Amino acid sequence: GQQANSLLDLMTIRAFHSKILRRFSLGTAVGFRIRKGDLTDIPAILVFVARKVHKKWLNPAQCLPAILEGPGGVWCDVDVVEFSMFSELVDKLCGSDECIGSGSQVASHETFGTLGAIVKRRTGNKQVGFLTNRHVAPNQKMFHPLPPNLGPGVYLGAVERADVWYGIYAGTNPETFVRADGAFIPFADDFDISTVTTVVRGVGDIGDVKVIDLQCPLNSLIGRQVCKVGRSSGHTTGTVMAYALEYNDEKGICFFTDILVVGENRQTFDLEGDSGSLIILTSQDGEKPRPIGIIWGGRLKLTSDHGPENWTSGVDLGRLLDRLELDIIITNESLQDAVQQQR
Amino acid sequence: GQQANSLLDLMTIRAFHSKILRRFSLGTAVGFRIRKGDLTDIPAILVFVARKVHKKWLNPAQCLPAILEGPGGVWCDVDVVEFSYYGMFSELVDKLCGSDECIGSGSQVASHETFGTLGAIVKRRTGNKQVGFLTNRHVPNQKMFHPLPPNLGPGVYLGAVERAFVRADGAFIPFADDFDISTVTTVVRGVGDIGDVKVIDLQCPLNSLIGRQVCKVGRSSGHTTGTVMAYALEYNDECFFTDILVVGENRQTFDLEGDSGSLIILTSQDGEKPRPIGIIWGGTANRGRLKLTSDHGPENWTSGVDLGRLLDRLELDIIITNESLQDAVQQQR
Amino acid sequence: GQQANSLLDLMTIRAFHSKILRRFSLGTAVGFRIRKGDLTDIPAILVFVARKVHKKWLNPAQCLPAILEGPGGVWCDVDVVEFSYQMFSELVDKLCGSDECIGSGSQVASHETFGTLGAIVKRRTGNKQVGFLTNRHVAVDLDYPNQKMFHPLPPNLGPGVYLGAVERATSFITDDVWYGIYAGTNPETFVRADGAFIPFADDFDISTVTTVVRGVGDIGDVKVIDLQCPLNSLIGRQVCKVGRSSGHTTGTVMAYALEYNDEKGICFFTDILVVGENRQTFDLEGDSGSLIILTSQDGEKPRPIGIIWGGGRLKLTSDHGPENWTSGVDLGRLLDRLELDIIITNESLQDAVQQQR
Ligand SMILES: Nc1ncnc2c1ncn2[C@@H]1O[C@H](COP(=O)(O)OP(=O)(O)OP(=O)(O)O)[C@@H](O)[C@H]1O
Ligand SMILES: Nc1ncnc2c1ncn2[C@@H]1O[C@H](COP(=O)(O)OP(=O)(O)OP(=O)(O)O)[C@@H](O)[C@H]1O
Ligand SMILES: Nc1ncnc2c1ncn2[C@@H]1O[C@H](COP(=O)(O)OP(=O)(O)OP(=O)(O)O)[C@@H](O)[C@H]1O
Ligand SMILES: [Mg+2]
Ligand SMILES: [Mg+2]
Ligand SMILES: [Mg+2]
C-alpha cells in the first residue's frame, strides 16, 4: 500500500471515489496539497467546493476526509479548495507585425482568439496550418487580424470540424458535457506561408512539445512555472496547479480540461481572446522553453488574505497533437521542410 | 431664550416646526452644523435636501431659515445638507465568513431570504432567559445559519428570528436547542473586549454622541471607522426613521451590503473599553449619498438603531465577557 | 508644386481625392502627421481607420499612399490613425449651482438634457438680445417643454431660475441638396456639429451673469480660425475647457474639419478635434457646450476658439490604450452663422444689457 507518486495514481484514486466525491463537491483535480496558501510536495486530490468553512460548521459526515485509498492500497491526500494588455508586443500580435506566428490574433465572423502553434499533419496531404482552441459554438473562416466584414486581413484557412461511452463510464452529462479541446486550421491553398514564423515572439525559440508522462513524479508538472503569449494580455507567467480537472453540474460531470494554471503574483494568467495561446514551460537551466498545452477559452480562493484568483484551462498539448495527428513546427528549417512536403 | 444644549432641545424644536421643515426637504435630523465641510460645535437641526443650491436660485418661500425657536424660546441653528436615499478581503473577513472556529460579533448570518452580520450576544432579561444574538430586522420563521443556509451551502443552524412608514429596528434570534454555545465568543474580533452598552442620554450635551468616532466589524467590510453625524433621522420621499447616522472616515465607506447588524462601537478615547451604541440597520446600507465637502464627491452614510433603546424594547441584556456568557448559559430555563 | 502650408491647402487636396480617401476609412481630417505617437510639423491629411495593420495584410487597393498631390501640384502627407466614433472639485460644485453667479461653465439643464454654458453673447443686429451660447443637441425631443433652460435644474428635478429657450437652428449649407451631393454627404443621417443661442428671458436678472471664465480667468476676443495662415496657429496648440462634469482640463488641437463616414457617405462633420493632455480625457458627458480656449503661454489673455459638441478610440501610442477625443465647433464661424458677438468683460455686458431693444 504505497503512497501515490504520479498523476496516474491520483487519477485512479479520484475515479475510484468519483461517484461519492461528486456528492459533496463542484469538481476535482489532482496535484499537490495546498496548505495555508502554499504548494506542498504532498500528492493530493484537489476537491473544489462552493464555500470552504471550518469543520465546526459542517454537518456530521459532511467533512471531506484527509486521506483516500484506491485500488491496490495506493493512497493520497484530499485537499479542499473553494471555487467562487497594451504594449509593443500586443500591437504586433494584433496586426502590426510583418509575420504571422504563435500569439498572432486570429478571428472569424463569429469568434476571435490567439494562434497557438504552427503544425503539420503527420499523414495524408501533410498540410501545414496552425493550432488554436476549439470554440464551443463547421466551415469557420479564419483571418488575421480581422475578417473581411470588420476590417482588413488575409484569409488563413477554415477550421477542421473534427460520445456515448463518456456518459456510460465517466458519468458525463451528455446534455452539457464539454472537454477542453484544440482545433486545426490548415492554411488555405493561396496563403503565403513565407509570412509565418515559428518563433514565439515574447519568449524566443521553443523546443519540441514536452509530453506529460502520467507515471513520472508529480513535480515534473505540478508547480512548474509556465508562460503564455496571447493577443489580449501579451506575455504572462503562471504556475501549473492541477491536472485532469472534472467539473460537476447537477446530473454529472459537465466539464473536463487537462491542465489548470494560475497566474503568478495574484495576476490573471489569461484574458478573453488569449484562448489558443501556447502554454510554455519557462527554462530553468538554459534549455529552450518547451510547450505543454493550449489555452482553452470562475474564480479560485487560494489565499485568506486576498480575494479569489482567476484560473486558466489548458489542453494537454502532446495528447492534442496525437488526437489530431499533428507535429509542431519549431524552426524555420522544419517549416520549409513541411511546406515542400505538402501534397 | 437660551441656545439648545442637548439632543432633546434640538428634537423638541424640530417637532414644533415639523410640517414646515418637511415641505421642502427629504428629511431632518439633529446634531451639529456642518460648515465649509467641517463639523462645528453649533447645535443645529440638519435639513436634508435632494439638491443644495445657492439662495439666488431659490424662490424666497423655499429658502430655509438659519435659526428656529421652539417652545420657551429655546433656539438652534438650521443646517442644509444635500442628501438622498438612492445615491473586503482580509484575514478578518475570512474568519467572519466561516473560517473561524467560533461565532461572535461580526460573524456572517444568513437565511434563505436574507444575510448580514451578527451584532451582539444577548440574553432575555426575564422568563426563560434564553441566550441568543442581535442583528438587524429585515424589512415563515426566517431561521438562520452560519455561514450559509442549507439551500446555498454549509453552515450550522443558529436559530429562528423572533418576531416582535418603517422604523429601523433590530431582531433577537434565540439560539437553537441543539446549538453549541461554547462555540460563541463575546469578543468583537478586530476591536477587542467591549464594555457595557452606552445609553444614549437625550439630555446631556451633544458632544457626547455627535462627532464621536465609531467603528464596526462586519462580514462585508471587516473593520471600518467613522463619525456619528446626527441623531433621530426622519426621511420622507413623498417613510423611514432611524436613530443614528454615521459617515465613514477618510472619505471611505463605513459599511457595505451585508454589514447590516454590525455593532456600532464608540472607540476608546482614554483607555476604557470601547462601548457599543447601536446596530447597523439594513436597507439604506449601500443606498444613499451625502455631500459633506465641495472638494470631494458625495459620501455614503449608514443607518444605526439605537442599541440601548433596542435592548429595552426587546428586553435584552448584552453579554460582554465569556465568563458572563458561561454563566448565562447555565441560568437558561 | 509647393508643400501644403495651410488648412485650405490640405482641405483642397482632401476634396480632390475624396473618393480614394473615403473608400476604406471611417473618416478624414487635416492637421500634422502623427508618427510614433508624437506630433510632427509635417502637414498631412489624417485618415481614420478602425484598425491600423501592417502593409502585408492590406490589398494594394486598400493601402493608403504616403503623399497626395492636388490641383496645381500642391502636395501633402497622408497619415493613418486608429480611430472609432463625475469629477468633483470646488469649481465643479460652484458650476453646478453653489455659485452666486451664472457664467461660462455653469450647468444649464432642460427637462431632457443638461450641459455647460459656453459664452455670454449678444445679437449683432435687430433687438440685440443678450443670451448665452451652448451646444446644439441632436437626437433630442425639442418640443415645447424641452427647450427651456434653467440653472441648475429644471422645475421637475429641483430648484433653479429660468434662463431662456433654445432658438431653433436657422440653417446650414449642408441643407442645400446641390452642395450636399458635391460634398458627398448622406442626407438621411448627416449631422453638422453646431452651437445654439439661448436669449435670456425677459425677467431673468442679468446682473447675476459674469463674463469671467472661472478656473481660467478673463478671456480675450474670439480667435478666428484663419484657413490660409500657417497650420501651427491652430494645429498642436494647447487649449483648456471648464465644464460642469470634469471641471478644468487641458488638451491639444489634433485636427481640423473632421468628416466622418457611414455606408452611404459623410454623416458627421465637426470643426475641431481635441485630445486630452497626459492620457486623460478632455471632456465628460455634460461638458458639451464648454468654451474651448487657447491657453496663453506668453502673458496675453486666453482666447476662445470653439464650443464642445456633445451627443471614440483614437489610439495614438502602442504602450498606452486608446484616448478619448473631443469634437469642437469653430467658434468664430458659429458666431458668424448665428450673427452673435461674444461679451468678454463685465462692463461690456452692462453696456449690451442697456443696449437691448
Ligand atoms: N464538504 C466540505 N465543504 C466545505 N468545506 C469543507 C468540506 N470538507 C472539509 N471542509 C473544510 O476544509 C478543511 C480541510 O482543508 P484542507 O484539506 O485544504 O486542509 P489543509 O490543506 O491542510 O489546510 P488549508 O486549509 O490551509 O489548505 C476542513 O477542515 C474543513 O474545514
Ligand atoms: N429648501 C432648500 N433647498 C435647497 N437648498 C437650500 C434650501 N434652503 C436653503 N438652501 C441653501 O442652503 C444654504 C444654507 O446652507 P447651510 O445652512 O449648510 O450653510 P452653512 O452650514 O453655514 O455653510 P455650508 O453651506 O458651507 O454648510 C442657503 O444659502 C441655500 O443656498
Ligand atoms: N487602409 C488601411 N487600413 C489600415 N491600415 C493601413 C491602411 N493603409 C495603410 N495602413 C497602414 O498605415 C501605415 C502608415 O501609417 P502612418 O502614415 O501613420 O505612418 P507614420 O505616421 O510615418 O508612422 P506611425 O505609424 O508611427 O504614425 C502603413 O504602414 C500601413 O501599414
Ligand atoms: Mg489545502
Ligand atoms: Mg451647513
Ligand atoms: Mg502617423
CSV table of C-alpha atoms in Angstrom, one decimal, chain B:
chain,number,residue,atom,x,y,z
B,1,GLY,CA,-34.0,82.4,25.2
B,2,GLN,CA,-31.1,80.1,25.7
B,3,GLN,CA,-29.4,78.1,22.9
B,4,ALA,CA,-30.1,74.4,22.5
B,5,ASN,CA,-27.7,72.2,24.5
B,6,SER,CA,-28.9,68.6,24.1
B,7,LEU,CA,-30.5,66.2,21.7
B,8,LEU,CA,-33.9,66.7,23.4
B,9,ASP,CA,-33.6,70.5,22.9
B,10,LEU,CA,-33.0,70.1,19.2
B,11,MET,CA,-35.8,67.5,18.8
B,12,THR,CA,-38.5,69.5,20.6
B,13,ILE,CA,-37.5,72.4,18.4
B,14,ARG,CA,-37.7,70.1,15.4
B,15,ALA,CA,-41.1,68.7,16.3
B,16,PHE,CA,-42.6,72.2,16.7
B,17,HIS,CA,-41.6,73.1,13.1
B,18,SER,CA,-42.1,69.6,11.7
B,19,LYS,CA,-44.6,70.4,8.9
B,20,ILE,CA,-42.8,73.5,7.8
B,21,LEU,CA,-39.4,71.7,7.6
B,22,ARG,CA,-40.8,68.8,5.6
B,23,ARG,CA,-42.4,71.0,2.9
B,24,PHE,CA,-39.0,71.5,1.1
B,25,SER,CA,-36.8,68.7,2.5
B,26,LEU,CA,-36.4,65.0,2.1
B,27,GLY,CA,-35.9,64.6,5.9
B,28,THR,CA,-34.3,66.0,9.0
B,29,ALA,CA,-32.0,65.0,11.9
B,30,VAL,CA,-30.4,66.7,14.8
B,31,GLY,CA,-26.7,67.3,15.5
B,32,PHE,CA,-24.0,69.9,14.9
B,33,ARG,CA,-24.0,72.4,12.0
B,34,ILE,CA,-21.7,71.4,9.1
B,35,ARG,CA,-20.0,74.5,7.6
B,36,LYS,CA,-17.5,74.5,4.8
B,37,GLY,CA,-17.3,70.8,5.2
B,38,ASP,CA,-16.2,70.8,8.8
B,39,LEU,CA,-18.2,69.9,12.0
B,40,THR,CA,-18.8,72.9,14.3
B,41,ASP,CA,-19.9,73.0,17.9
B,42,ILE,CA,-23.1,74.8,16.9
B,43,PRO,CA,-26.2,72.7,17.8
B,44,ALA,CA,-28.4,72.5,14.7
B,45,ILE,CA,-31.3,70.8,13.0
B,46,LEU,CA,-29.9,69.2,9.9
B,47,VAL,CA,-32.3,69.6,7.0
B,48,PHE,CA,-31.7,67.1,4.1
B,49,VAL,CA,-32.5,68.3,0.6
B,50,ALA,CA,-32.2,66.5,-2.7
B,51,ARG,CA,-30.1,69.2,-4.3
B,52,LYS,CA,-28.5,72.1,-2.4
B,53,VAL,CA,-28.1,75.3,-4.4
B,54,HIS,CA,-27.2,79.0,-3.8
B,55,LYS,CA,-30.0,81.2,-2.4
B,56,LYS,CA,-30.0,83.3,-5.5
B,57,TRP,CA,-31.6,80.4,-7.5
B,58,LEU,CA,-34.2,79.6,-4.8
B,59,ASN,CA,-37.6,81.1,-4.5
B,60,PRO,CA,-37.8,83.0,-1.2
B,61,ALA,CA,-40.6,80.8,0.0
B,62,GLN,CA,-38.4,77.7,-0.3
B,63,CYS,CA,-35.2,79.1,1.3
B,64,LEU,CA,-34.8,77.6,4.8
B,65,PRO,CA,-34.1,79.9,7.7
B,66,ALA,CA,-30.8,79.8,9.7
B,67,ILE,CA,-32.4,79.7,13.1
B,68,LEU,CA,-35.5,78.2,14.7
B,69,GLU,CA,-37.1,78.9,18.0
B,70,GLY,CA,-39.2,76.3,19.8
B,71,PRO,CA,-41.3,76.3,22.9
B,72,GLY,CA,-40.0,78.6,25.7
B,73,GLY,CA,-37.6,80.4,23.4
B,74,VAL,CA,-35.2,77.5,23.1
B,75,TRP,CA,-33.4,78.0,19.7
B,76,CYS,CA,-30.9,76.3,17.5
B,77,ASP,CA,-29.3,76.5,14.0
B,78,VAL,CA,-30.7,75.1,10.8
B,79,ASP,CA,-28.2,73.4,8.5
B,80,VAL,CA,-28.8,72.4,4.9
B,81,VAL,CA,-27.3,69.2,3.7
B,82,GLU,CA,-27.5,67.6,0.2
B,83,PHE,CA,-28.9,64.1,0.8
B,84,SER,CA,-30.8,61.2,-0.8
B,85,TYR,CA,-31.8,57.6,-0.1
B,86,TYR,CA,-30.8,56.4,-3.6
B,87,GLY,CA,-27.4,58.0,-4.3
B,88,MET,CA,-13.3,43.4,1.8
B,89,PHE,CA,-10.7,40.7,1.5
B,90,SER,CA,-8.6,40.1,4.7
B,91,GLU,CA,-7.9,37.5,7.3
B,92,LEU,CA,-10.6,39.1,9.5
B,93,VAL,CA,-13.3,39.0,6.8
B,94,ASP,CA,-12.4,35.4,6.0
B,95,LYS,CA,-12.8,34.4,9.7
B,96,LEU,CA,-16.2,36.3,9.9
B,97,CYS,CA,-17.5,34.5,6.8
B,98,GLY,CA,-16.9,30.9,8.0
B,99,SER,CA,-13.3,30.0,8.5
B,100,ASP,CA,-13.1,30.8,12.3
B,101,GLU,CA,-13.6,28.2,15.0
B,102,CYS,CA,-16.0,30.5,16.8
B,103,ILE,CA,-19.1,32.5,16.2
B,104,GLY,CA,-19.5,36.1,17.5
B,105,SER,CA,-20.0,39.7,16.7
B,106,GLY,CA,-19.0,40.2,13.0
B,107,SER,CA,-19.9,36.7,12.0
B,108,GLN,CA,-21.9,36.2,8.9
B,109,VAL,CA,-25.5,35.0,9.4
B,110,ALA,CA,-27.8,34.0,6.5
B,111,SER,CA,-31.2,32.6,5.8
B,112,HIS,CA,-32.9,31.6,2.6
B,113,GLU,CA,-34.1,35.2,2.3
B,114,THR,CA,-31.5,37.5,3.9
B,115,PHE,CA,-27.9,37.7,5.0
B,116,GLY,CA,-26.0,40.0,7.3
B,117,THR,CA,-23.7,40.3,10.4
B,118,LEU,CA,-24.2,39.1,13.9
B,119,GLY,CA,-24.2,42.2,16.1
B,120,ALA,CA,-24.1,41.2,19.8
B,121,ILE,CA,-24.5,38.2,22.1
B,122,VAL,CA,-27.6,38.8,24.3
B,123,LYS,CA,-30.0,37.1,26.7
B,124,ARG,CA,-33.6,37.7,27.7
B,125,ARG,CA,-33.9,39.7,30.9
B,126,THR,CA,-36.9,37.8,32.3
B,127,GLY,CA,-38.7,34.5,31.8
B,128,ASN,CA,-36.6,31.7,30.4
B,129,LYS,CA,-33.5,34.0,30.0
B,130,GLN,CA,-32.6,32.4,26.6
B,131,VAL,CA,-29.2,33.3,25.1
B,132,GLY,CA,-29.2,34.4,21.5
B,133,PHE,CA,-27.8,37.2,19.3
B,134,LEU,CA,-28.9,40.6,18.0
B,135,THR,CA,-28.9,41.7,14.4
B,136,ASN,CA,-31.0,44.0,12.1
B,137,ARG,CA,-34.6,43.2,11.4
B,138,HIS,CA,-35.0,42.8,7.6
B,139,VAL,CA,-37.9,44.8,6.2
B,140,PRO,CA,-42.4,31.7,8.0
B,141,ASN,CA,-39.8,32.0,10.7
B,142,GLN,CA,-36.6,33.0,8.8
B,143,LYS,CA,-34.3,30.5,10.6
B,144,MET,CA,-30.6,31.4,10.5
B,145,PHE,CA,-27.3,29.7,9.7
B,146,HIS,CA,-23.6,30.4,9.8
B,147,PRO,CA,-22.3,30.9,7.3
B,148,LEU,CA,-24.9,29.7,4.8
B,149,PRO,CA,-28.4,28.2,4.8
B,150,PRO,CA,-28.7,24.6,3.6
B,151,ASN,CA,-30.1,25.6,0.2
B,152,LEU,CA,-27.0,27.8,-0.5
B,153,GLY,CA,-24.1,26.0,1.3
B,154,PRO,CA,-22.7,24.6,4.5
B,155,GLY,CA,-23.4,26.0,8.0
B,156,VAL,CA,-24.7,25.4,11.4
B,157,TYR,CA,-28.3,26.3,12.4
B,158,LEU,CA,-28.3,29.2,14.8
B,159,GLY,CA,-32.0,29.7,15.5
B,160,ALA,CA,-35.1,31.3,14.2
B,161,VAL,CA,-35.8,35.1,14.2
B,162,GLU,CA,-38.3,36.1,16.9
B,163,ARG,CA,-40.9,38.4,15.5
B,164,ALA,CA,-41.8,41.4,17.8
B,165,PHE,CA,-43.6,54.2,7.4
B,166,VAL,CA,-40.7,51.9,8.5
B,167,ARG,CA,-38.8,52.3,11.7
B,168,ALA,CA,-35.2,51.0,11.9
B,169,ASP,CA,-35.1,48.0,14.3
B,170,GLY,CA,-33.1,45.0,15.5
B,171,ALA,CA,-34.2,41.4,15.9
B,172,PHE,CA,-33.4,38.7,18.5
B,173,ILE,CA,-32.5,35.2,17.4
B,174,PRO,CA,-32.6,32.9,20.4
B,175,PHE,CA,-30.1,30.1,20.0
B,176,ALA,CA,-31.5,26.7,18.9
B,177,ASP,CA,-32.0,24.0,21.4
B,178,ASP,CA,-29.1,21.9,19.9
B,179,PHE,CA,-26.7,24.8,19.2
B,180,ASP,CA,-23.3,24.6,21.0
B,181,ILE,CA,-23.0,27.9,22.7
B,182,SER,CA,-19.4,27.0,23.7
B,183,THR,CA,-18.5,27.9,20.1
B,184,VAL,CA,-19.6,31.5,20.8
B,185,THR,CA,-17.3,34.3,21.9
B,186,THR,CA,-18.3,37.7,23.4
B,187,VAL,CA,-15.1,39.3,21.9
B,188,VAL,CA,-15.5,41.7,19.0
B,189,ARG,CA,-12.7,40.5,16.7
B,190,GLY,CA,-10.6,43.3,15.4
B,191,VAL,CA,-11.7,45.6,18.3
B,192,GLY,CA,-11.1,43.5,21.4
B,193,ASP,CA,-13.2,43.3,24.6
B,194,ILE,CA,-16.1,45.8,24.8
B,195,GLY,CA,-17.7,47.4,27.7
B,196,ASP,CA,-21.4,47.7,28.5
B,197,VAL,CA,-23.8,49.4,26.2
B,198,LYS,CA,-23.5,53.2,26.3
B,199,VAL,CA,-27.0,54.6,26.8
B,200,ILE,CA,-27.7,57.5,24.5
B,201,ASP,CA,-28.8,60.2,27.0
B,202,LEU,CA,-31.1,62.7,25.3
B,203,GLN,CA,-30.4,65.4,27.9
B,204,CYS,CA,-26.6,65.5,28.1
B,205,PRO,CA,-24.5,67.8,25.9
B,206,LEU,CA,-24.5,67.0,22.2
B,207,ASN,CA,-20.8,66.3,22.1
B,208,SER,CA,-21.3,63.0,24.0
B,209,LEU,CA,-22.7,61.5,20.8
B,210,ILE,CA,-22.4,63.9,17.8
B,211,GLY,CA,-18.9,63.9,16.4
B,212,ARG,CA,-17.7,60.8,18.3
B,213,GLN,CA,-15.5,58.3,16.5
B,214,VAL,CA,-17.1,54.9,16.0
B,215,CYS,CA,-16.1,51.6,14.5
B,216,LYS,CA,-17.9,48.4,13.3
B,217,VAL,CA,-16.8,44.9,12.3
B,218,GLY,CA,-18.9,43.3,9.7
B,219,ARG,CA,-18.8,40.4,7.3
B,220,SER,CA,-18.5,42.5,4.1
B,221,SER,CA,-16.1,45.3,5.0
B,222,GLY,CA,-14.3,44.0,8.1
B,223,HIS,CA,-13.2,46.8,10.3
B,224,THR,CA,-14.1,50.5,9.5
B,225,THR,CA,-14.1,53.7,11.5
B,226,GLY,CA,-16.5,56.6,11.2
B,227,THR,CA,-18.1,59.6,12.8
B,228,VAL,CA,-21.6,60.0,14.2
B,229,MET,CA,-23.1,62.8,12.2
B,230,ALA,CA,-26.7,63.1,13.5
B,231,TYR,CA,-29.4,61.5,15.6
B,232,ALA,CA,-33.1,60.9,15.0
B,233,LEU,CA,-33.2,60.9,11.2
B,234,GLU,CA,-36.6,61.2,9.7
B,235,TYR,CA,-37.0,60.6,5.9
B,236,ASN,CA,-40.0,61.2,3.7
B,237,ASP,CA,-39.7,60.8,-0.1
B,238,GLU,CA,-43.3,61.8,-0.9
B,239,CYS,CA,-41.3,56.7,5.1
B,240,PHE,CA,-38.5,55.7,7.4
B,241,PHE,CA,-36.9,56.7,10.8
B,242,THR,CA,-33.5,55.6,12.1
B,243,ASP,CA,-31.7,56.5,15.2
B,244,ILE,CA,-28.0,57.1,14.3
B,245,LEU,CA,-26.3,58.5,11.2
B,246,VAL,CA,-22.7,57.5,10.5
B,247,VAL,CA,-20.3,58.6,7.8
B,248,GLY,CA,-17.1,56.7,7.2
B,249,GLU,CA,-13.8,58.3,7.9
B,250,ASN,CA,-11.2,59.5,5.3
B,251,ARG,CA,-13.9,59.6,2.6
B,252,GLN,CA,-14.1,55.8,2.9
B,253,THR,CA,-17.5,54.0,3.2
B,254,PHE,CA,-18.4,52.9,6.7
B,255,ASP,CA,-20.4,49.8,5.6
B,256,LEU,CA,-21.3,47.6,2.6
B,257,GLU,CA,-24.3,45.5,1.9
B,258,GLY,CA,-24.1,42.5,4.3
B,259,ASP,CA,-22.6,44.6,7.1
B,260,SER,CA,-26.2,45.3,8.4
B,261,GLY,CA,-26.5,44.1,12.0
B,262,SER,CA,-22.9,45.1,12.8
B,263,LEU,CA,-22.3,46.6,16.2
B,264,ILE,CA,-21.6,50.3,16.1
B,265,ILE,CA,-19.0,50.9,18.8
B,266,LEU,CA,-17.6,54.1,20.3
B,267,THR,CA,-13.8,53.9,20.1
B,268,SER,CA,-11.9,54.3,23.4
B,269,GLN,CA,-10.6,57.8,23.9
B,270,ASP,CA,-8.9,57.4,27.3
B,271,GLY,CA,-8.1,53.7,27.9
B,272,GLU,CA,-11.5,52.4,28.8
B,273,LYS,CA,-13.1,49.6,26.9
B,274,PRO,CA,-15.0,50.6,23.7
B,275,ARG,CA,-18.7,50.7,24.2
B,276,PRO,CA,-21.5,49.8,21.7
B,277,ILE,CA,-24.2,52.4,20.9
B,278,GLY,CA,-26.0,50.8,18.1
B,279,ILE,CA,-26.6,48.2,15.4
B,280,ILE,CA,-26.3,48.9,11.7
B,281,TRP,CA,-29.7,48.8,10.0
B,282,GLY,CA,-30.3,47.1,6.7
B,283,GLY,CA,-31.9,48.9,3.9
B,284,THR,CA,-30.1,52.2,3.1
B,285,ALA,CA,-26.9,50.2,3.6
B,286,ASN,CA,-25.5,50.6,0.1
B,287,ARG,CA,-28.0,53.2,-0.9
B,288,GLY,CA,-27.7,56.9,0.0
B,289,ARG,CA,-25.4,59.8,-0.8
B,290,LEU,CA,-24.4,62.7,1.5
B,291,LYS,CA,-22.5,65.8,0.3
B,292,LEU,CA,-20.2,66.9,3.1
B,293,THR,CA,-17.4,68.7,1.3
B,294,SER,CA,-17.4,70.5,-2.0
B,295,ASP,CA,-13.9,69.2,-2.6
B,296,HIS,CA,-14.9,65.6,-2.8
B,297,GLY,CA,-18.0,63.9,-4.2
B,298,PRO,CA,-20.9,62.6,-2.1
B,299,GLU,CA,-20.1,60.1,0.6
B,300,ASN,CA,-22.1,57.1,1.8
B,301,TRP,CA,-24.0,57.2,5.0
B,302,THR,CA,-25.1,54.4,7.3
B,303,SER,CA,-28.3,53.9,9.5
B,304,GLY,CA,-27.9,52.8,13.1
B,305,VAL,CA,-30.5,51.5,15.5
B,306,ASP,CA,-30.1,52.9,19.0
B,307,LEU,CA,-28.7,50.0,20.9
B,308,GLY,CA,-29.8,50.9,24.4
B,309,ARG,CA,-33.4,51.6,23.3
B,310,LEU,CA,-33.3,48.4,21.2
B,311,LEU,CA,-32.3,46.3,24.2
B,312,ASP,CA,-35.1,47.9,26.3
B,313,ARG,CA,-37.8,47.4,23.8
B,314,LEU,CA,-36.8,43.7,23.3
B,315,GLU,CA,-36.0,43.4,27.0
B,316,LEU,CA,-32.5,42.0,26.4
B,317,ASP,CA,-29.1,42.3,28.1
B,318,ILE,CA,-25.9,42.3,26.2
B,319,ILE,CA,-23.2,39.8,27.2
B,320,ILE,CA,-19.7,41.2,27.1
B,321,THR,CA,-17.4,38.6,28.7
B,322,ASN,CA,-17.0,34.9,28.1
B,323,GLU,CA,-17.4,34.4,31.8
B,324,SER,CA,-20.8,36.2,31.8
B,325,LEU,CA,-21.7,34.1,28.8
B,326,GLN,CA,-20.8,30.8,30.5
B,327,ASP,CA,-22.9,32.0,33.5
B,328,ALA,CA,-25.9,32.9,31.3
B,329,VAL,CA,-25.9,29.5,29.6
B,330,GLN,CA,-26.1,27.8,33.0
B,331,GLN,CA,-29.1,30.1,34.0
B,332,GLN,CA,-31.3,29.3,31.0
B,333,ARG,CA,-34.5,27.6,31.9
